[PDB]
Design a protein around this nucleic acid. Structure first.
Lengths: 157, 111
DNA sequence: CCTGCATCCGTGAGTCGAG
DNA sequence: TATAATGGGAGCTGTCACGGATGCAGG
């Protein structure tokens, strides 16, 4: 099982009062508390790429190929869209209910917050790990030990 | 006990890579491949077995196996790797021979 | 543990002749 | 020098009596 380290940048917009203000967010730590269901709307137009994790997900919006948007969906927010779907500015991408928090897999290193109206658009720098399994036949052998860090191009088996 | 396929493959691999490592150490130190092989084997088997080999150009006493072992250990790290490779190669060889001994019985029972 | 009896193991079992 | 093969096989049976050592239950 190779856990691949990935660090990206994704925005999330929330009601201003509901947000619990913190410099950074530990995995599982409460991101906010909602008095009432809040739909998280699309701020850009394009096709949707939904990348789902063990818990929580990523919405990558794009026109042509190059991504025009990257949104992060934390725990407690149920996605309202499918993969490969057309969305326009203002239509709900997902639905957040009650208390929402960070996934146990991913951690937010730094948070850039912006005041706009009654909301705040958080720019998250997120770090997580995506696992990939490799089946080993009896005729092969593992050249790497337990918990050993490998870079790109390095031989495992 | 009898080997599982993975163990068979593993031992064979260790043996082959061990021989390759011996050729490598021969290319490095400049000694006889047979000499190096018999020194590695001497260290793997134990202190119990050291005996003059008809093939070697020199008498192999523990004194000489220690001289050669000391000339092998004093090599640079990346070169010293092949020593360990060869050692585990010989151990794997012993284990491999000892593992398949039943086959010899079942073959010789027909003769 | 020291003595005594039960048990196992090895050792023997005529000479010469003829085949 | 390359499918894979992975713990044997016959046994000799109806003598007899000894010395010495070895072992076990009993006083």
């Amino acid at each position: 099982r190779v856990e691949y380290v990935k660090k990206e940048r994704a925005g999330l917009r929330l009601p201003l009062a509901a947000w619990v203000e913190k410099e950074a967010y530990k995995p599982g730590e409460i991101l906010a508390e909602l008095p009432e269901p809040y739909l998280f709307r699309a701020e850009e137009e394009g096709v949707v790429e939904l990348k789902e994790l063990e818990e929580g997900a990523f919405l990558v919006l794009r026109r042509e190929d190059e991504p025009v948007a990257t949104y992060f969906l934390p725990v407690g927010m149920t996605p309202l869209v499918v993969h490969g779907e057309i969305v326009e500015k203002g239509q709900p991408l997902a639905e957040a209910k009650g208390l929402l928090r960070m996934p146990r897999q991913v951690r937010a290193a730094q948070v850039e917050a912006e005041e706009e109206g009654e909301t705040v658009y958080l720019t998250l720098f997120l770090e997580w790990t995506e696992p990939k399994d490799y089946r080993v036949q009896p005729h092969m052998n593992v050249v790497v030990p337990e918990g050993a860090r490998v870079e790109a191009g390095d031989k495992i088996v | 006990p009898l080997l599982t396929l993975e163990e068979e493959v593993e031992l064979a691999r260790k043996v082959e890579e061990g021989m390759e490592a011996i050729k490598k150490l021969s290319e490095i130190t400049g000694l006889d491949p047979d000499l190096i092989r018999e020194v590695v084997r001497a260290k793997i088997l134990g202190s119990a077995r050291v005996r003059h080999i008809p093939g070697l150009k020199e008498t192999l006493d523990p004194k000489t196996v220690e001289e050669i072992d000391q000339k092998l250990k004093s090599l640079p790290k990346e070169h010293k790797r092949y020593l360990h490779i060869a050692r585990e190669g010989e151990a794997a060889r012993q284990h491999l021979i000892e593992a398949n001994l039943r086959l010899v019985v079942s073959i010789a029972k027909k003769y």
